[PDB]
Design a protein around this motif. Structure first.
Motif, mmCIF file in Angstrom:
data_model
loop_
_atom_site.group_PDB
_atom_site.id
_atom_site.type_symbol
_atom_site.label_atom_id
_atom_site.label_comp_id
_atom_site.label_asym_id
_atom_site.label_seq_id
_atom_site.Cartn_x
_atom_site.Cartn_y
_atom_site.Cartn_z
ATOM 1 N N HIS A 15 30.056 -64.681 6.199
ATOM 2 C CA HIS A 15 28.963 -64.922 7.141
ATOM 3 C C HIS A 15 27.609 -64.601 6.512
ATOM 4 O O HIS A 15 26.637 -65.353 6.680
ATOM 5 C CB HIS A 15 29.183 -64.087 8.409
ATOM 6 C CG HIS A 15 28.066 -64.177 9.406
ATOM 7 N ND1 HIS A 15 26.974 -63.334 9.383
ATOM 8 C CD2 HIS A 15 27.878 -65.005 10.464
ATOM 9 C CE1 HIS A 15 26.155 -63.648 10.376
ATOM 10 N NE2 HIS A 15 26.685 -64.653 11.049
ATOM 11 N N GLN A 16 27.529 -63.477 5.800
ATOM 12 C CA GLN A 16 26.318 -63.116 5.073
ATOM 13 C C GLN A 16 25.900 -64.214 4.102
ATOM 14 O O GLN A 16 24.754 -64.678 4.131
ATOM 15 C CB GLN A 16 26.542 -61.800 4.325
ATOM 16 C CG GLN A 16 25.423 -61.407 3.364
ATOM 17 C CD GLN A 16 24.163 -60.949 4.089
ATOM 18 O OE1 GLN A 16 24.221 -60.159 5.037
ATOM 19 N NE2 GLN A 16 23.017 -61.441 3.643
ATOM 20 N N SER A 19 24.771 -67.368 5.790
ATOM 21 C CA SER A 19 23.484 -67.112 6.425
ATOM 22 C C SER A 19 22.345 -67.248 5.418
ATOM 23 O O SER A 19 21.323 -67.893 5.699
ATOM 24 C CB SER A 19 23.515 -65.722 7.073
ATOM 25 O OG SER A 19 22.269 -65.372 7.658
ATOM 26 N N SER A 23 19.210 -70.123 5.240
ATOM 27 C CA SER A 23 17.928 -69.523 5.621
ATOM 28 C C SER A 23 16.725 -70.457 5.454
ATOM 29 O O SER A 23 15.763 -70.327 6.222
ATOM 30 C CB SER A 23 17.672 -68.232 4.836
ATOM 31 O OG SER A 23 17.589 -68.483 3.442
ATOM 32 N N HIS A 26 16.270 -72.208 8.944
ATOM 33 C CA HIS A 26 16.389 -71.389 10.137
ATOM 34 C C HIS A 26 15.359 -71.783 11.189
ATOM 35 O O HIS A 26 14.157 -71.872 10.903
ATOM 36 C CB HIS A 26 16.218 -69.924 9.764
ATOM 37 C CG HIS A 26 16.284 -69.004 10.938
ATOM 38 N ND1 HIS A 26 15.159 -68.490 11.545
ATOM 39 C CD2 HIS A 26 17.345 -68.500 11.613
ATOM 40 C CE1 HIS A 26 15.524 -67.706 12.544
ATOM 41 N NE2 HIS A 26 16.847 -67.701 12.610
ATOM 42 N N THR A 29 17.055 -67.268 16.239
ATOM 43 C CA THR A 29 18.243 -66.431 16.434
ATOM 44 C C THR A 29 18.089 -65.714 17.769
ATOM 45 O O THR A 29 17.035 -65.128 18.029
ATOM 46 C CB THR A 29 18.403 -65.408 15.296
ATOM 47 O OG1 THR A 29 18.498 -66.108 14.052
ATOM 48 C CG2 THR A 29 19.669 -64.465 15.508
ATOM 49 N N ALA A 138 22.550 -67.864 15.454
ATOM 50 C CA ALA A 138 21.470 -68.295 14.583
ATOM 51 C C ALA A 138 21.525 -69.812 14.484
ATOM 52 O O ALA A 138 22.592 -70.374 14.212
ATOM 53 C CB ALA A 138 21.606 -67.641 13.198
#
Ligand SMILES: Nc1nc2c(ncn2[C@@H]2O[C@H](COP(=O)(O)OP(=O)(O)CP(=O)(O)O)[C@@H](O)[C@H]2O)c(=O)[nH]1
Ligand SMILES: Nc1nc2c(ncn2[C@@H]2O[C@H](COP(=O)(O)OP(=O)(O)CP(=O)(O)O)[C@@H](O)[C@H]2O)c(=O)[nH]1
Ligand SMILES: [Cl-]
Ligand SMILES: [Cl-]
Ligand SMILES: [Cl-]
Ligand SMILES: [Cl-]
Ligand SMILES: [Cl-]
Ligand SMILES: [Cl-]
Ligand SMILES: [Mg+2]
Ligand SMILES: [Mg+2]
Ligand SMILES: [Mg+2]
Ligand SMILES: [Mg+2]
Lengths: 210, 210
Positions: A15-16, A19, A23, A26, A29, A138
């Protein structure tokens, strides 16, 4: 008919790294608390239906939804849904006294559909809260304006991570999405059950990735 | 690349009757105030770019966006955009002192893109507010989960009405949307200009429907 791609990530580390990979795309969130309701006898569950009141952040926004007869296969979801934003104060009043749901939601198209298709008593004195769970979502605007939703879902009993994409072209977008996860090195599998199903089951699907 | 269908309605009565026709699909309605910014010399305008700070309802939500080199033909829009939600308090501080924009937005991907692609001074002492306009947007989830946005746009100088749909299949969805407006008896034409273009022009496009 609502069509979504639904892929599950195995771990916090996956997940990190996803993400971070997304980014540059984005958009926002937000924190969601999802609560669910049914008759004491489970009449909606018996016809494969889920009635959800979702609260965003600190009672900032509220969405009511009825979702019916979901199907899920090979990472592709189809579900019948009807949803609408409502006054969060009313959503909270429903939560506090769900036996008043029919009078509190009397003007809602969604409550009207609950009655007209499941035959529940119009006043809602039968309804009870099933509980709920929390989710951090997010949101990303990706290639061709596709919207990706990366979820961190905290049930009472464990955490799951998913990425999802609503589309009118499920087979081609799922190819796009799988291709991006491979090129970025992100393990994934097709989601085998909805968050509602996992909630009601009381445990995490066995995570059969290999 | 962001792709949208954009159709213009001629009149309040057409907007009323379409609003009624879509009411079974209603998801939400919100108030937007759109404000725009550029250098005093118009450097972003010179490269066909629009920098917008949008406020929702009573300073409830704020979105920053850079939109570049739009194209519009036969009801189909393509535009390069990058946008992200920001703290409404910061959006308002930018509005109050746009010469502080570079320090106020220093961590934004969007502000970073303004600098890296237009070469504006990093501190933003050059930026000024162009003004803005108000818009009421009603959102609908339609067939195949398509999202329709019905807008009532109040410029200083007049009101316009549009319906729009973001899609990855512009030719087929536009056929769907045109077919629905015909069957419901709703006059329409293809939008000939964006709301930003109409704002800057200071008058309403001539409404050439016939
Ligand atoms: N343009 C637009 N799309 C929205 C909006 N709200 C929801 N959607 C679309 O519907 C989905 C999110 O809302 P929802 O219908 O509740 O789906 P969900 O139940 O959260 C997905 P899951 O069950 O896996 O958690 C997304 O796939 C999204 O593309 C909206 O406000 N605007
Ligand atoms: N799922 C989802 N889609 C969104 C969301 N926000 C915007 N979109 C999509 O992007 C569009 C609305 O936001 P935006 O990029 O500013 O377009 P716009 O500038 O308002 C359209 P116009 O210029 O004609 O007024 C919509 O077409 C929508 O489908 C969101 O939060 N969730
Ligand atoms: Cl990993
Ligand atoms: Cl969200
Ligand atoms: Cl859910
Ligand atoms: Cl009319
Ligand atoms: Cl809106
Ligand atoms: Cl605009
Ligand atoms: Mg859905
Ligand atoms: Mg729904
Ligand atoms: Mg756009
Ligand atoms: Mg945009």
């Amino acid at each position: 008919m609502e069509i979504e791609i639904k892929l599950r990530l195995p771990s916090p580390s996956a997940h990190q790294l996803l993400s971070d990979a997304l980014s540059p795309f984005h958009l926002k969130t937000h924190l969601q608390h999802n609560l669910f309701f049914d008759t004491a006898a489970g009449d909606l569950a018996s016809v494969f239906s889920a009635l959800r009141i979702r609260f965003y952040d600190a009672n900032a926004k509220c969405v009511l939804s009825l979702k019916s007869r979901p199907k899920l296969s090979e990472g592709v979801s189809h579900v019948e849904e009807d949803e609408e934003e409502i006054d969060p104060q009313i959503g909270q009043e429903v939560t506090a006294n769900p036996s008043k749901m029919g009078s509190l939601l009397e003007k809602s198209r969604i409550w009207r559909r609950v009655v007209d298709e499941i035959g529940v008593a119009d006043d809602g004195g039968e309804f009870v809260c099933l509980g709920g769970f929390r989710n951090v979502r997010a949101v990303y605007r990706w290639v061709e304006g596709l919207i990706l939703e990366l979820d961190e879902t905290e049930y009472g009993f464990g955490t799951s991570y998913e990425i999802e994409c609503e589309t009118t072209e499920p087979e081609r977008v799922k190819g796009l999405l799988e291709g991006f996860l491979k090129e970025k090195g992100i393990p994934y599998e097709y989601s085998g059950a909805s968050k509602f199903a996992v909630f009601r089951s009381g445990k995490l699907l066995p995570l059969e990735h290999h």
